[PDB]
Amino acid sequence: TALRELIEELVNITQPLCNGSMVWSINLTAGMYCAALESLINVSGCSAIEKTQRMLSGFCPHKVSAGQFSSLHVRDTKIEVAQFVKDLLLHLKKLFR
Amino acid sequence: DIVMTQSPDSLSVSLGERATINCRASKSVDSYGNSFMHWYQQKPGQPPKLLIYLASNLESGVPDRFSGSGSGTDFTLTISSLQAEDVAVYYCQQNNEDPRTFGGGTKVEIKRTVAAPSVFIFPPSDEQLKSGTASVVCLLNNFYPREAKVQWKVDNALQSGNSQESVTEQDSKDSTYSLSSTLTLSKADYEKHKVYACEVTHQGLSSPVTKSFNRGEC
Amino acid sequence: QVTLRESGPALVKPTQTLTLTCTVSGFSLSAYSVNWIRQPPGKALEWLAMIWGDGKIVYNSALKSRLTISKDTSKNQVVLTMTNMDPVDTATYYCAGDGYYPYAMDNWGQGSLVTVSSASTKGPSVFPLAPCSRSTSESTAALGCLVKDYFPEPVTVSWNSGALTSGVHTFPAVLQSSGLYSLSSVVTVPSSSLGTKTYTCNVDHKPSNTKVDKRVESK
């Protein structure tokens, strides 16, 4: 349901994305919807990712603020939002199976 | 098109007392279990300032006496102990669905002890008189409550239709109001009379206060 | 250190087009969303339009046919145009930037007051407000400036070039039956300072480019 919709949205948006805006690479493990949400929350002025952020906020209802981290521990590799969505898309389709 | 409706339109609360404001949306402002509604504070002559986002999150730097609550259609903004500096108009706003919309606002005022006005009268300046007009100004300073009556008298004749009043918003420090009343006459009417008086009636005054001057100095 | 600053005409003729410019500094418009909001004097905020950093444009529904928002990333400005201006459109127009997700409007400009009228700009005459006399027993004294017969709003009034703010009351302007505004600004000071400390009101009427400094004293 919401998980298919989240995958649908990520494919829907990868058909550039947040041009000039880099996000942190996410360690995709134990239902890390919070880690994905923490990585994207630092993107400013991008209408294209709003739905994904709201959808992710549905799965992770905890307080998540821009700049402040709790879920994220692996802060080293910085990527394009397109690359991040493609990395999130690989993990999300693995959980769906 | 989400319509935001606030209640009450205005409210008056004592210093250090709890203040509560309500907001109602025409459609749900919820998406995936989160409320896309925000609260703003607007002080007189300034732009709005964000206080609360996502219905209950405090904006960084905002005092902790402010809080927000609610879901779907009904929301609340609460000030735990109203401060003199909290006088303002508060607005709710949604971004769940385009277009973004604001509520109509709620004015918050402080209820304080009665304070009589200090009254001053100012004659027209010689420079203004040269141009053919005379403005006579009466100032009622730092009073509470806002209600006050100013009666202009020229040689004891009660004036009407020739004065205009303007009032400040409640002071952010002492919670009082100030008011000016301007009596405007042509230079010809001004020079035909002697005594210019402003009589003030207020809850803080047990008897009306008159400030006056005589044209051509007295 | 993000700042927003609106610029545009103080006065637009009825039926003519209003063009407002919002200059953004400290954030690239390629990743910063800018909103336009207006506020008629004494009335509610009304959201008008927005342009996201990535280009998405949204308009108020009732005013949609009259509004055009656009941007130029080079000059870092967002432009709003509103056609067929009416006296009911007289308001302070604000531009405001979105914060991060959930995208509330966390950064506002000071706002630009736009008046829609066929009347001409007229600079004020500034007169002193000084009592005819004071009582030998009064602790507090009042002084002021009467800023008369100007158009359109606003006028700015400061005291002692902004150094004096305590006890200053600048009243809301009143529209006279002539169609011109009048405003009074007063200050109350302890009586022990007169003749010693100077009190000067600094009046600025940006629409007519009128700037006056007047030292106020009793005759």
Side-chain angles (χ1 to χ4, degrees), chain C residues 45-119:
Chain C
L45 295 168
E46 181 179 41
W47 187 86
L48 300 172
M50 83 179 290
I51 189 167
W52 291 74
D54 71 338
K56 191 193 195 297
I57 293 177
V58 187
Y59 295 112
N60 170 284
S61 61
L63 301 163
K64 203 187 254 69
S65 67
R66 289 216 276 149
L67 296 169
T68 315
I69 194 177
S70 62
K71 69 157 123 183
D72 172 38
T73 48
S74 285
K75 290 195 264 82
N76 229 47
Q77 46 178 241
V78 176
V79 170
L80 188 78
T81 75
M82 191 177 193
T83 55
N84 195 21
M85 293 301 280
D86 188 82
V88 303
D89 301 304
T90 293
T92 299
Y93 290 72
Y94 294 101
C95 62
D98 276 3
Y100 290 91
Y101 174 81
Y103 311 117
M105 293 168 275
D106 75 352
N107 187 10
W108 294 69
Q110 286 303 297
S112 186
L113 178 58
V114 173
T115 301
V116 180
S117 183
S118 54

Side-chain angles (χ1 to χ4, degrees), chain B residues 145-164:
Chain B
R146 196 199 263 118
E147 8 305 306
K149 182 181 120 164
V150 171
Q151 174 68 65
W152 281 99
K153 297 168 205 205
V154 176
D155 293 329
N156 231 25
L158 302 200
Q159 304 299 295
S160 54
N162 52 14
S163 60
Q164 291 188 108

Side-chain angles (χ1 to χ4, degrees), chain A residues 9 13 21 23 25 31 35 37 45 59 62 67 72 80 82 89 91-92:
Chain A
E9 244 308 273
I13 71 165
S21 291
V23 293
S25 213
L37 184 55
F59 282 104
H62 305 287
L72 182 45
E80 290 175 332
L89 216 33
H91 165 247
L92 256 43

Side-chain angles (χ1 to χ4, degrees), chain B residues 123-135:
Chain B
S125 64
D126 292 329
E127 36 267 73
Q128 187 189 18
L129 294 174
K130 283 190 203 78
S131 60
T133 301
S135 303

Side-chain angles (χ1 to χ4, degrees), chain B residues 1 34 36 38 40 42 45-50 52-54 59 91 93 95 98-105 118-128 131 133 135 137 139-142 164-168 171 173 176 178-180 182 184 211 213-214 217-218, chain C residues 35 37 39 43-48 50 52 56 58-62 64 94 98 101-106 108-111 126-133 138 140-144 146 148 166-167 169-177 182 184 186-188 214 219:
Chain B
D1 220 268
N34 290 301
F36 297 86
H38 325 281
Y40 299 83
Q42 185 181 33
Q46 292 179 15
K49 160 189 187 185
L50 178 66
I52 305 286
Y53 64 94
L54 233 225
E59 178 60 11
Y91 294 92
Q93 177 254 317
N95 71 321
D98 284 338
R100 272 122 91 125
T101 50
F102 282 97
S118 293
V119 189
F120 299 93
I121 192 174
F122 309 102
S125 64
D126 292 329
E127 36 267 73
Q128 187 189 18
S131 60
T133 301
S135 303
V137 178
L139 169 62
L140 280 61
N141 213 38
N142 304 340
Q164 291 188 108
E165 277 187 3
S166 168
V167 187
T168 59
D171 186 74
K173 281 167 60 54
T176 68
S178 297
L179 177 153
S180 68
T182 301
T184 301
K211 299 290 181 197
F213 68 88
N214 294 161
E217 193 173 71
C218 306
Chain C
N35 299 257
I37 302 101
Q39 189 171 50
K43 286 151 73 191
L45 295 168
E46 181 179 41
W47 187 86
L48 300 172
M50 83 179 290
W52 291 74
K56 191 193 195 297
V58 187
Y59 295 112
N60 170 284
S61 61
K64 203 187 254 69
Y94 294 101
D98 276 3
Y101 174 81
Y103 311 117
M105 293 168 275
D106 75 352
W108 294 69
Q110 286 303 297
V126 180
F127 303 114
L129 295 172
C132 191
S133 71
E138 279 177 317
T140 191
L143 295 176
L146 172 61
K148 208 193 198 296
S166 190
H169 293 294
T170 298
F171 292 94
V174 181
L175 192 273
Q176 306 160 102
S177 66
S182 183
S184 271
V186 300
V187 66
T188 66
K214 181 179 288 292
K219 304 140 206 74

